[PDB]
Write a protein that binds this ligand. Structure first.
Ligand SMILES: [Co+2]
Ligand SMILES: [Co+2]
Lengths: 225, 202, 225, 202
């Protein structure tokens, strides 16, 4: 989708806010938010692409200025409510209860050894997106390709700033989960993946750095020539 | 400045309540436990950090054949040091030279090689860096990181639009001939491996 | 500039908020804000293009969700402070004074007959941007032209959604004030102006309406062929 | 919803104070007076409104030669009715037919033909309409205005990127044969002349 989140080449967002040091987690709430990445995919219902798409659908003004891990809470709720696994009315009721009783306990629950094993395994084993497919790569190193000007309303990895621009294929990586399907609940439908080099002059015209290139990863259907 | 925005205190207080509410429902559904949350936090607070990336760097600096394997296939080379997994299943390492400076970004979100760098710092995930580094990389490196890349030197910006994670092998600082792997490691930073700074001088 | 304000073709901004009726001015403050359009250009220092550019430089999260006439206050202050005609410290002092004393009086001042004459004349006479130039139009009706992929960091009227896209010249209007100079304080440097027709398929690819076109006004340097 | 945003009451209270502060300094510099502010407001509250556009419409409906002049040069034709000036120095009027539906937008800000329509309503100036109408015009017209433009009918979207102001001459409703200029005018709306609605039926 043509969301504000697609910020590559956006002007006016202002100077970088970089404190000299920071902790990994700035608040206990951030640890809870982080733990929802592996909770969401543990339950195989939703993957990383759909998780991204929930964030892309945020109120942009909220997205641009909220703490990062708020984005993770929004996307978990977005999928929760759509699948009926989260009741919004019950959630608003609980939000108010915990506004008024911040130190009220969490619900009593059994710990689960399987959740620790699942975490350790995902963290050190990874969740690989590489897939085998029956067709060979359409394209190769040195091929000069134009990125699609298609503008899907669901999830995709088509940064506005590379659309209809010309580049050179740098590397074929194999086939991977295809966002345009996986992120819209239409499954993996894996596609060959390529890194493509775009010059700064191609991307930005004469206002681009005279001696700079951007490398952007393109699934096969994103490119022709 | 945004005249419509609440205080940091009011934002934190509202987020805290919303998260505890969401957490209470996920606990009751059995898909979240206190132990699961504590384990994820403990891993990225104390187990997985840029000290891992630093070992890969100093090995490539002191081992030409390991460097070639790192540049050929970052995932396979990092597995030689027992380093890999979540959000670095597919790593491509790229080499700073006298000809070329590399800097990495996720313009679309925050994608970052967790297994070598741990979780990205907040500035990396925020719109200011993400929007500007693909468009004014030399000016950004100068103004934000005090890092002057001479105009004749090409700046390559790697935008992680896929599960491929890009990692910078920074140049070995001058005056470190014959240094131990441990001495060289004190020079390797998170920033040097994003490409927003060189490795430390001296 | 590649600002968020350039919202044409942006997805995710949400449903239109349209009350069944509304007044022209929703609050007395809006009348004061409105009166700054003719106050700013009366004093020939800044024109309409520079007024637009001040708005484009707003914090996007503030721009996206603020009452419209707040944009007018931001751009007046932006030019005020840059030209040194508004002292920011004095302005913050006055803001706080009027926060704490909302019904405190305005400064005593003489009314000015010339300001009423200037208003009536601008309103019914207009502030025409059409200019005569020494060169004839480069282009004509039926010419097939590609919009520039230049990406100026100052003011321009180059909507991201038309950049590098192909259209047909529909009408030549004469020469007008050229934003890329006027809005950056570089003067009128007037250019021939054309309406260009872009198909929905050209603008959006296959996700565009199969039976729709967008008409966009292009200054001569924006187009070639 | 935006969890970071203050209440409408808090926003209005802060804007009010900032504007009174700015107004106090502009008064002291002599470039703003209470009389100047009151005159601008009075003009666009009671003198300049869509009733002006409605006269141009009913004249074009009842006068084929005036219609041709309106479509050739909107500014010159509107001057025949003593109608023109600020933010409509350059008007191009466009004709709804059975073949073609016109709708106008300012994607970059709020540009709008003040001299025939008065100041644009808030929805016109806001990001929701501006972003969507160039990309999903049929769906927007259906969902927001209950206006179904059949797929076979072309939708032309006019984006005022220049001082050229685009104004829709809507089709004359059926069943109005021989109606007075005053009767026809009751059918002409602000919306009909933006192109987000047809002229009123019956
Ligand atoms: Co990312
Ligand atoms: Co406008």
């Amino acid at each position: 989708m043509n969301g504000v989140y697609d910020v590559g080449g956006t002007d006016g967002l202002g100077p970088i806010n970089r404190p000299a040091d920071e902790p990994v987690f700035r608040a206990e709430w951030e640890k809870v938010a982080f733990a929802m990445f592996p909770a969401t995919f543990r339950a195989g219902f939703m993957g990383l692409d759909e998780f991204r798409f929930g964030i892309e659908q945020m109120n942009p003004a909220e997205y641009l200025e909220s703490p990062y891990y708020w984005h993770w809470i929004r996307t978990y709720i977005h999928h929760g409510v759509r699948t009926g696994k989260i009741d919004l009315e019950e959630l608003e009721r609980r939000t108010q209860y915990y506004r008024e009783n911040p130190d009220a306990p969490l619900p009593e629950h059994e710990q689960k050894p399987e959740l620790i094993e699942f975490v350790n395994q995902a963290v050190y084993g990874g969740l690989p997106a590489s897939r085998e497919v029956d067709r060979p790569p359409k394209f190769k190193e040195g091929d000069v390709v134009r990125f699609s000007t298609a503008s899907p309303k669901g999830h995709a990895r088509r940064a506005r700033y590379v659309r209809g621009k010309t580049g050179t294929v740098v590397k074929h990586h194999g086939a991977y989960i295809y966002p345009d399907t996986a992120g819209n609940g239409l499954g993996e439908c894996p596609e060959h993946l390529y890194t493509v080099r775009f010059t700064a002059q191609e991307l930005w015209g004469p206002e681009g750095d005279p001696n700079s290139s951007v490398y952007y990863d393109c699934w096969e259907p994103y490119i022709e020539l | 400045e945004n005249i419509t925005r609440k205080s940091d205190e009011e934002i934190q207080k509202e987020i805290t309540a919303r998260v505890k509410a969401l957490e209470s429902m996920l606990i009751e559904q059995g898909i979240l436990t206190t132990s699961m949350i504590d384990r994820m936090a403990e891993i990225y607070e104390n187990e997985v950090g840029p000290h891992l990336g630093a070992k890969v760097v100093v090995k490539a600096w002191t081992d030409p054949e390991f460097k070639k394997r790192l540049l050929a296939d970052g995932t396979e080379a990092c597995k030689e040091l027992g380093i890999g997994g979540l959000q670095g299943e597919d790593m491509m390492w790229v080499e700073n030279t006298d000809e070329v400076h590399h800097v990495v970004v996720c313009t679309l979100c925050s994608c970052y090689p967790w297994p070598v760098l741990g979780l990205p710092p907040n500035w990396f995930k925020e719109p200011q860096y993400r929007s500007r580094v693909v468009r004014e990389p030399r000016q950004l490196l100068k103004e934000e990181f005090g890092f002057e890349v001479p105009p004749s030197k090409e700046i390559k910006v790697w935008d992680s639009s896929s599960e491929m994670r890009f990692v910078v092998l920074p140049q070995r600082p001058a005056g470190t001939d014959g240094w131990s792997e441990e001495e060289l490691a004190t020079l390797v930073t998170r920033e040097s491996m994003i490409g927003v700074e060189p490795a430390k001088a001296v």
